[PDB]
């Protein structure tokens, strides 16, 4: 009797394995990926984006904006001492 037709019916091996699910994710995801990002934000020259550029970089954990920002509040109230005295 003639061989049956199972080997040639493939359309439930298109969901049949788990990486089909992953495939339909990364055919979208990686295809819509850019070569490099859009932009990281670091500066924009609003003149305080420069503050971010010098101090608040991705790799700058350096305490300098803190010191500067602290010193700003010291400059503020010290003048206000002379506003009240």
């Amino acid at each position: 009797v003639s061989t049956l037709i199972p080997p040639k019916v493939v359309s439930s091996k298109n969901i049949g394995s788990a990486p089909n699910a992953k495939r339909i994710a990364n055919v979208v995801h990686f295809y819509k990926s850019l070569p490099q990002g859009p932009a990281p934000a670091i500066k924009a020259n609003t003149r305080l984006a420069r503050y971010k550029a010098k101090y608040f970089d991705g790799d700058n954990a350096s305490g300098k904006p803190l010191w500067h920002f602290a010193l700003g509040i010291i400059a503020f109230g010290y003048s206000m001492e002379y506003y009240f005295h």
């Binding site: 934000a41 970089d57 790799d59 010291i74």
Partner: protein
Amino acid sequence: LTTFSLYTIIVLLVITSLYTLTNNNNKIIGSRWLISQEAIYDTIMNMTKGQIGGKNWGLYFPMIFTLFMFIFIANLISMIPYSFALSAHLVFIISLSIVI
């Protein structure tokens, strides 16, 4: 104006800067500064899931977060050696306590 009003504005401006230039426009990798405000998020997440844990635990999570951050910033600002202590105007902190 009022001294109290002026320093409340200063606190507001401090709090804004930690989420608008600390970050690198929300870089997934995470910036050195933005790691700080991640850790704060996690320790109040894991604290207020632990305290007021239950079906609702996150419904009062913003309130407990802005009660953290207000006091956390107001105990640095109030410690600058020439600054007007909002917190050492005890009546505001105590009023807030009685309100809650």
